[PDB]
Design a protein around this ligand. Sequence first.
Ligand SMILES: Cc1cc2nc3c(=O)[nH]c(=O)nc-3n(C[C@H](O)[C@H](O)[C@H](O)COP(=O)(O)O)c2cc1C
Ligand SMILES: Cc1cc2nc3c(=O)[nH]c(=O)nc-3n(C[C@H](O)[C@H](O)[C@H](O)COP(=O)(O)O)c2cc1C
Lengths: 209, 211
Amino acid sequence: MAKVLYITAHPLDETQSYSMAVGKAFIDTYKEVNPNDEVIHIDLYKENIPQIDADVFSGWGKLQSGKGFEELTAEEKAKVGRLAELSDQFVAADKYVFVTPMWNFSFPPVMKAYIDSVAVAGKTFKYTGSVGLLTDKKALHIQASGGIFSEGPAAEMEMGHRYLQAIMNFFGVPSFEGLFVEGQNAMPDKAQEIKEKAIARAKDLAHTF
Amino acid sequence: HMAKVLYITAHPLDETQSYSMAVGKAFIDTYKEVNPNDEVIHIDLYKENIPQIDADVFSGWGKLQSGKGFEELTAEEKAKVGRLAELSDQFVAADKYVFVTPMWNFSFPPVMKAYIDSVAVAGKTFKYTEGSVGLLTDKKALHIQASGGIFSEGPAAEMEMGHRYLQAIMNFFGVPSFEGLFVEGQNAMPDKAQEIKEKAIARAKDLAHTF
Ligand SMILES: Cc1cc2nc3c(=O)[nH]c(=O)nc-3n(C[C@H](O)[C@H](O)[C@H](O)COP(=O)(O)O)c2cc1C
Ligand SMILES: Cc1cc2nc3c(=O)[nH]c(=O)nc-3n(C[C@H](O)[C@H](O)[C@H](O)COP(=O)(O)O)c2cc1C
């Protein structure tokens, strides 16, 4: 039945991270409710997510100019092939769950490397400006932040959800939702309640996502 | 010698193959010609070691935060925590920053975020308050960005996320002056590519006389 990419960008586990704990409650409940679904954890700190580098440009340039994958160097093939797998896996899925901590207003670097690995002309978008191809998908972003960024002055500083929002628009993903676990550092006295309330929200959302 | 300038580039290709690096290079060559005494350091984020924050960095920070000496860090914790400290100290010690990036999917290459994560350090570039305040009150910065389409202006302005992010961080750090120079349109209107670039190079040269 449906394929769901549970995409995490956190080097810590659900015992040490508010985003991972919330995500964990979400995705556990999602599998409970949808036992038939293909739920794939993409762990961006365990998988190799190649940044686009000189080898990638050179490997791509070769393929572009008619060359065979055989003709790439070992490094070019390893990076290029990995990016192709990432790309293919993303298009093949039905639903996306991104889970991130807020670091300096946005997400860990590897979340940008993941987006770069799946943003591929002819797969997630096409030139026209551009139009998105992923017109039958859905996505959720679970984001943790020390202070409050969903409301108030700080909302103009929020840049991680804002970026993923732009990308979802770019890919033509028709349904996108934010679930924020926010304010636990600005209000340490309210940290457990903030967490638990976000968990309850996540488990409810998992019953219809 | 009198000011220290960090020329921070995030491109795998060089000034002969990249619009951003071509404009960056005209800028910095000229800046050096006009300010020969300034120390200008090229930080090429594709060649340098720019560690991402990972399990080892969290662990080693944690240790340091709990009152352990650096000596109690593992070898890999020391190398990564050490390196992040070098980057952080280097950033604070400079007087001016020049960021040079291509626009990839509305923003910059992943390594640019790693470098920002490396320098965004409490007690160095900002401090907490009873929110926060920037400490880089007497620094200055410039961002040169290249994009295939136009994102500085037009209805696509709302999609721009690279410059916007660095603007947020320069605000967070208290930097009172942050300028953008865009080289844009060259892929959307390929018959205008050479003129787009030559106008941006001339602008870069011009700016280098006052930066
Ligand atoms: C490197 C770094 C940068 C951070 N930057 C921010 C920030 O810009 N804004 C914020 O509110 N909290 C920031 N925090 C606090 C975390 O966002 C917060 O502790 C949150 O719970 C992180 O998600 P996690 O608990 O899933 O790790 C940062 C923490 C670290 C290590
Ligand atoms: C991986 C990748 C992603 C890109 N994403 C964007 C984008 O969002 N917007 C855009 O106008 N161009 C995009 N481009 C095109 C580059 O911005 C364009 O080639 C531009 O001239 C980049 O600057 P450079 O010339 O310094 O590389 C992308 C190119 C690549 C390889």
